[PDB]
Ligand binder design. Structure first.
Ligand SMILES: *[C@H]1O[C@H](CO)[C@H](O)[C@H](O)[C@H]1NC(C)=O
Ligand SMILES: *[C@H]1O[C@H](CO)[C@H](O)[C@H](O)[C@H]1NC(C)=O
Ligand SMILES: *[C@H]1O[C@H](CO)[C@H](O)[C@H](O)[C@H]1NC(C)=O
Length: 7
């Protein structure tokens, strides 16, 4: 699991 560029 990973986090995506929090816009
Ligand atoms: C986050 O990065 C990891 C690294 O292996 C995976 O590619 C995962 O699928 C990524 N998550 C998203 C939402 O792209
Ligand atoms: C996803 O967001 C989290 C929380 O800020 C971390 O910064 C993480 O390094 C991010 N993942 C990517 C691939 O930039
Ligand atoms: C990153 O963006 C993806 C959509 O491509 C998802 O909304 C994911 O939940 C996001 N991650 C964060 C930490 O907001």
């Amino acid at each position: 699991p990973t986090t995506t560029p929090l816009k």
